[PDB]
């Protein structure tokens, strides 16, 4: 009757995990493939966020450590002229700083910031940095950018990575317009909290996606179809010296401040904003009721870290305030400013062993970015918060669209031909 | 309404030659495969030819299998067989049909389903 | 008709385009992409072993002496070959290919040896 | 009688050494080492999948029935095969071998399935 | 009927568990667990690749043209295939192999010649 026929280079494949390669500085349809995705599921993104940390960890291994720096510090009020934004926000730290000569001292003062110091026995002019007690920090190399330039994944042969382009897909369940890709687009891997900066927008409509949306453990990822223009500045002329604290190896500090002391802040524009929240409540009545309250709500509490926006601004590390973005409640030339703090001593990751010290950058700062999305967490009345402070979120929102199979190219099917 | 029309040759002289074609409507062409079988005037019939639906293959009866030749055309639909020598034995009325073979991954055959009208074949 | 263009196709559609995908199954930092170059060469080798242990070495389509049960699939030629697509298929047997693989290989020993014997 | 000691002789004699130059196609510091290995076995499959696909597994000397076309070279067989050693012969014609790669494979497809459906 | 199983069997009993051991060759720290599993992978292709050398590319059973010298072995038949395991066996030759194997290559070389010009 029939008989078993051996084919091979049958086009089958299964779901499957594997390590994927870079490419920095091809599509094929699939007519009739329907394929079930699943973000949060998606071990691309866990292969990101290793990756990113490690290459971040990489690039701090050829820079100086700062040990010598582990010493009281004698700290007084910067004598300039400071508004009531700024007072205590600053302090004239002195130091007896280690030479290129090991039976040397130098007498070095500094500006720091007062998030990076703190007092010793309740003491108000004997400070030591934040992290003698817990790390040694190493700084930056000052030749090295945080630019987070794009990254393409490619499959190893044998696997492929099949792309979602239903231009309504939330991030699980089937697509009915797939096609294989050879690599992904490139992701640049921008590091930010609560709002997410320049990334893909949605292409038609604002994009709710959550894990399991009435659970209020889960965060959702709101993913806008416009972008909010943000302008973000620190507006303070900094002098940057430095000193060789050992052999071949310099400090670099901020010495001094020309003109007056004023806060860092970002601006986004009230009406592009309101605009925009008006259409993620649209959306979010889709999930919860039509005849309801959706109100958003400043973060409720958990360190600068968390409870802020921060982002990288040219270098400089901004903890920005959103309580006058998220201040609503929405029943049934303008703009907004945020104040920002300004911190060297950074954790990056949520880890406790490593911190890093960014060198102050000479002049003056201003960094421009798209808001493309919004990080929120839940608490009738629905109440809506900020959230982020897990990396990987913000990498899931790129990466939802792709997905890794293996191809299995042997089988077999009953035919008329026999041997 | 499935139709094979052959519009052939007539007349030829012995040790001669002449061409038959049959074109086909109202099914996929290329979906099967195709024969000629024979008839001489006072006889039954006799199996001629056999072509495979990709044209590829092709099988005769002893009697002309060094002298006929069955060809195929997917793309107009067309059936023909090029006959050579042509011996008064091969007056006949050569029928074009449909079936006799299948593909491994189809149904089999073995039988013809189709037949056109014939085109007669004289050899003086 | 590039690799896996013909994955929504059909069984009898899909067989023509077998040397597209067989040509893409072949090609501290810079460890863990040589463990999935060798990891993919080791793979490949596996499933060209397991050919040649069904005697289907050196070609995509193999008929064999193994007959269809159909208790493995009661689907007639026009079910399979022009409906189920391949990733269909899959499915439906993916509970038999063990039972299947092992009734090839005992077929292929009893054809080696037979062969053998009339060689002497 | 070693390794390319043939390179410099006609390709009618050079063609009987296949086999001298087939064997010698097999066999943080040390990384680059395994790459090299790595590479080389990846290279060495890839021809003989390739020569696998065009109907050529498992022998040096492969006949095929791709006709040659003048255009790719209108030299007769003195010319070839009592002169132009291997080396020459492929500078002449590396203009052609993609075209002359893709007709192998086209007619290995026809091939096999010829051959099932007169094995059904 | 495992891996080794019939290692103290007789050679003509052994002979049947082909696939058995045919399946049991393919599958800074941790460079030294790629590079075991690199040389498998090497070894492998290279007795792969001498079986096509003589001619028994994709069998586990290859009748050759290469008559035995009784200077290799003057045992009968009975001797051994009915006694002598294939350990034993491998003992008394191995002095004899690579004379063998030059043997087989050589034949293989005539044959293929032989068949392009009957193609001819
Ligand atoms: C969101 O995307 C926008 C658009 O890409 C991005 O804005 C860009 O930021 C970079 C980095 O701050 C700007 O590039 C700098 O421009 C100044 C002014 O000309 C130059 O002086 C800088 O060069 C010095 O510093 C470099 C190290 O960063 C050194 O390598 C160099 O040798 C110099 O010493 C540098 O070129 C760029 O101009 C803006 N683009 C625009 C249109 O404004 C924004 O930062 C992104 N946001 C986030 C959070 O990622
Ligand atoms: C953010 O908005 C404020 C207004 O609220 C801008 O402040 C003005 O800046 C101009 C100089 O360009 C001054 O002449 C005005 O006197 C300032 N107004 C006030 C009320 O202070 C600020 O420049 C904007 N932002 C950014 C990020 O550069
Ligand atoms: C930090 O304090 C130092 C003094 O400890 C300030 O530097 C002095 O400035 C006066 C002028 O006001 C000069 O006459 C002294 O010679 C300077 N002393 C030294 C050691 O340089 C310094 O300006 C203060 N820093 C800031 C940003 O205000
Ligand atoms: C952002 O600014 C708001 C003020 O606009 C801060 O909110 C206040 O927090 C204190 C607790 O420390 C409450 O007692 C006040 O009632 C809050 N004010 C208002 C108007 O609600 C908020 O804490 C700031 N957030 C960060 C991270 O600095
Ligand atoms: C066909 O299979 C029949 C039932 O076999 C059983 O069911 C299948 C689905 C498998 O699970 C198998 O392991 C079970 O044994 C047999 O009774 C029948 O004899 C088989 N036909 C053959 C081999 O001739
Ligand atoms: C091939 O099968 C066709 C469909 O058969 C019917 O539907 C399938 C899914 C089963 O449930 C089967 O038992 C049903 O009878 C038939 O229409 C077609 O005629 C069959 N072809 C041949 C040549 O037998
Ligand atoms: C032989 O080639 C003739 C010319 O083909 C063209 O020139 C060669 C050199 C290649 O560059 C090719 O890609 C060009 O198309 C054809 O006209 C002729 O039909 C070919 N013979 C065959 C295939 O029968
Ligand atoms: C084979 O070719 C020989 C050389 O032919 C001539 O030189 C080559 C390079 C071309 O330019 C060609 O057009 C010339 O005619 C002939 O001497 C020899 O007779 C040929 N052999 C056969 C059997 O035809
Ligand atoms: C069989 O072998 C005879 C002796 O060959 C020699 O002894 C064997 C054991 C090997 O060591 C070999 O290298 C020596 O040459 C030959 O005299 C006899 O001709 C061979 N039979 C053949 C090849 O027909
Ligand atoms: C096969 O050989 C058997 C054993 O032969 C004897 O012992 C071996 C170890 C040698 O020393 C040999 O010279 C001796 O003659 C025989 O008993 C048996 O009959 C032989 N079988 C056949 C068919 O000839
Ligand atoms: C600082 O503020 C005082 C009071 O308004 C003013 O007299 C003084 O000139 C300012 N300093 C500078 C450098 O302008
Ligand atoms: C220094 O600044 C702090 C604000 O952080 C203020 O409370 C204190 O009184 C100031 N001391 C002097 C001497 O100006
Ligand atoms: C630096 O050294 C001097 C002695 O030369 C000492 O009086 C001063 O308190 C030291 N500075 C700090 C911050 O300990
Ligand atoms: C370092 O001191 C701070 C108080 O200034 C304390 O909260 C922190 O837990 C200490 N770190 C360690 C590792 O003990
Ligand atoms: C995402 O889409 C799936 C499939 O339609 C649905 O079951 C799920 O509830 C949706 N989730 C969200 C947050 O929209
Ligand atoms: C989703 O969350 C609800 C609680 O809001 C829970 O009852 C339900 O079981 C969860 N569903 C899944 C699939 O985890
Ligand atoms: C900042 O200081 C530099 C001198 O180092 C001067 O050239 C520049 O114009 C100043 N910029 C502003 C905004 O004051
Ligand atoms: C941001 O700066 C651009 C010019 O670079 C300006 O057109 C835009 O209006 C500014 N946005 C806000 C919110 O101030
Ligand atoms: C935001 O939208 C609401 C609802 O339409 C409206 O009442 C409110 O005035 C708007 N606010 C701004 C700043 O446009
Ligand atoms: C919710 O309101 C919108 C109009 O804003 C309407 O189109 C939609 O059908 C309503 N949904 C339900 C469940 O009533
Ligand atoms: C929210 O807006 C009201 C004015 O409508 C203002 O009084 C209140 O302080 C704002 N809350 C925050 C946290 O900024
Ligand atoms: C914001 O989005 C627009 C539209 O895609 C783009 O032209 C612009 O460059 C983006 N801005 C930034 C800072 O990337
Ligand atoms: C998808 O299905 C349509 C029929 O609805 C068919 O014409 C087309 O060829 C199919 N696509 C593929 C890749 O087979
Ligand atoms: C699908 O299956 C049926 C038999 O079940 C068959 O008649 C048909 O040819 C197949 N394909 C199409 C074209 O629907
Ligand atoms: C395959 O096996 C599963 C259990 O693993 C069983 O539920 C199913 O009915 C079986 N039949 C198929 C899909 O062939
Ligand atoms: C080199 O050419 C000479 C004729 O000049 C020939 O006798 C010799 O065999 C050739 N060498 C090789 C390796 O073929
Ligand atoms: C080289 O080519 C010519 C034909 O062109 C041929 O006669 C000769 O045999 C070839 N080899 C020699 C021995 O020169
Ligand atoms: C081969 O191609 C080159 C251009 O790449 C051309 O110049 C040459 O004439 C071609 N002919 C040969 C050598 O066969
Ligand atoms: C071991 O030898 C005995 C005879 O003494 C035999 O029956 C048994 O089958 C042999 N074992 C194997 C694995 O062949
Ligand atoms: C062992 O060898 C002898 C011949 O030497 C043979 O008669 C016998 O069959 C072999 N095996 C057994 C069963 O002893
Ligand atoms: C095999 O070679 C060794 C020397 O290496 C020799 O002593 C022995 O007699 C030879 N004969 C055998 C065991 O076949």
């Known amino acids: 009757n029939l008989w078993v026929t051996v084919y091979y280079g049958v086009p089958v494949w299964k779901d499957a995990e594997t390590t994927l390669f870079c490419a920095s500085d091809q599509e094929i349809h699939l007519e009739n493939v329907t394929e079930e995705f699943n973000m949060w599921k998606n071990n691309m993104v866990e292969q990101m966020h290793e990756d990113i940390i490690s290459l971040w960890d990489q690039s701090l291994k050829p820079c100086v450590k700062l040990t010598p720096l582990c010493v009281t510090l004698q700290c007084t009020n910067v004598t300039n002229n400071i508004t009531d934004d700024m007072r205590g926000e600053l302090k004239n730290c002195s130091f007896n700083a280690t030479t290129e000569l090991r039976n040397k001292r130098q007498k070095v003062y500094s500006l720091f910031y007062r998030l990076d110091i703190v007092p010793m026995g309740e003491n108000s002019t004997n400070y030591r940095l934040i992290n003698c007690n817990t790390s040694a920090i190493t700084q930056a190399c000052p030749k090295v950018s945080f630019e987070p330039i794009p990254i393409h994944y490619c499959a190893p042969a044998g696997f492929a990575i099949l792309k979602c382009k239903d231009k309504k897909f939330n991030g699980t369940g089937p697509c009915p317009s797939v096609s294989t890709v050879q690599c992904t687009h490139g992701i640049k891997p921008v590091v930010s909290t609560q709002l997410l900066l320049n990334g893909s927008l949605a292409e038609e409509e604002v994009i709710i996606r959550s894990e399991n949306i009435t659970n209020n453990a889960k965060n959702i990822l709101v993913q806008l179809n416009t972008p909010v223009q943000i302008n973000c500045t620190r507006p303070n002329n900094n002098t940057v010296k430095s000193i060789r604290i050992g052999p071949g190896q310099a400090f670099y500090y901020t010495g001094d401040i020309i003109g007056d002391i004023r806060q860092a802040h970002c601006n986004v524009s009230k009406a592009t904003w309101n605009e925009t929240l008006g259409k993620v409540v649209k959306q979010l009545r889709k999930h919860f009721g039509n005849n309801t309250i959706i109100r958003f709500a400043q973060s409720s509490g958990g360190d600068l870290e968390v409870t802020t926006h921060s982002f990288n601004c040219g270098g400089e590390f901004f903890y920005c305030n959103t309580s006058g973005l998220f201040n609503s409640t929405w029943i049934s030339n303008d703009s907004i400013t945020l104040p920002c703090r300004i911190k060297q001593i950074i954790n990056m990751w949520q880890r406790i062993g490593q911190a890093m010290y960014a060198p102050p950058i000479q002049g003056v700062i201003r960094c421009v970015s798209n808001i493309t999305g919004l990080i929120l967490t839940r608490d009738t009345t629905e109440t809506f918060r900020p959230g982020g402070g897990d990396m990987r979120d913000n990498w899931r929102s790129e990466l939802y669209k792709y997905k890794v199979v293996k191809i299995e190219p042997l089988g077999v099917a009953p035919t008329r031909c026999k041997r | 309404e499935v139709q094979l029309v052959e519009t052939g040759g007539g007349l030829v002289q012995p040790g001669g030659s002449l061409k038959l074609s049959c074109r086909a409507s109202?099914?996929?062409?290329?979906?099967?495969?195709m024969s000629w079988v024979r008839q001489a005037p006072g006889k039954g019939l006799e199996w001629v030819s056999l072509?495979?639906?990709?044209?590829?293959?092709?099988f005769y009866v002893d009697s002309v299998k060094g002298r006929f030749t069955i060809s195929r055309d997917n793309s107009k639909n067309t059936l023909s067989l090029q006959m050579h020598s042509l011996r008064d034995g091969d007056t006949a009325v050569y029928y074009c049909?449909?079936?006799?073979?299948?593909?491994?991954?189809?149904?089999?055959?073995?039988?013809?389903?189709?037949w056109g009208q014939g085109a007669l074949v004289t050899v003086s | 008709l590039g690799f896996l263009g013909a994955a929504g196709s059909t069984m009898g559609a899909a067989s023509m385009t077998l040397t597209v995908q067989a040509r893409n199954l072949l090609s501290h930092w810079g460890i863990k992409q040589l463990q999935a170059r060798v990891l993919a060469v080791e793979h490949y080798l596996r499933d060209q072993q397991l050919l040649g242990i069904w005697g289907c070495s050196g070609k995509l389509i193999c008929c064999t002496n193994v007959p269809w049960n159909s208790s493995w699939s009661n689907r007639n030629l026009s079910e399979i070959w022009d409906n189920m697509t391949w990733l269909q298929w899959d499915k439906e047997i993916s509970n038999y290919t063990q039972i299947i693989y092992g009734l090839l290989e005992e077929s292929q020993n009893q054809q080696e040896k037979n062969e053998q014997d009339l060689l002497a | 009688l070693g390794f390319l000691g043939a390179a410099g002789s006609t390709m009618g004699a050079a063609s009987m050494t296949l086999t001298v130059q087939a064997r010698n196609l097999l066999s943080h510091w040390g990384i680059k080492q395994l790459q090299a290995r790595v590479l080389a076995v990846e290279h060495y499959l890839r021809d003989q999948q390739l020569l696998g696909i065009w109907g050529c597994s498992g022998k040096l000397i492969c006949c095929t029935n791709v006709p040659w076309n003048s255009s790719w070279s209108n030299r007769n067989l003195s010319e070839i095969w009592d002169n132009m050693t291997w080396l020459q012969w492929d500078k002449e014609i590396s203009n052609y071998t993609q075209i002359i790669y893709g007709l192998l494979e086209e007619s290995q497809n026809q091939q096999e399935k010829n051959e099932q459906d007169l094995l059904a | 009927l495992g891996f080794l199983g019939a290692a103290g069997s007789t050679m003509g009993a052994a002979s049947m568990t082909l696939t058995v051991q045919a399946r049991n060759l393919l599958s800074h720290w941790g460079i030294k667990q790629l590079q075991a599993r690199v040389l498998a992978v090497e070894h492998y292709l290279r007795d792969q690749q001498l079986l096509g050398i003589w001619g028994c590319s994709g069998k586990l059973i290859c009748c050759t043209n290469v008559p035995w010298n009784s200077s290799w072995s003057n045992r009968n038949l009975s001797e051994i295939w009915d006694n002598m395991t294939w350990l034993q066996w491998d003992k008394e030759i191995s002095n004899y192999t690579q004379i063998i194997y030059g043997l087989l290559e050589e034949s293989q070389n005539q044959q293929e010649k032989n068949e392009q010009d009957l193609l001819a």
């Open positions: 072509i495979n639906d990709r044209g590829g293959l092709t």
């Open positions: 109202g099914y996929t062409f290329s979906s099967f495969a």
């Open positions: 049909a449909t079936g006799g073979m299948s593909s491994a991954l189809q149904s089999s055959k073995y039988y013809f389903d189709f």
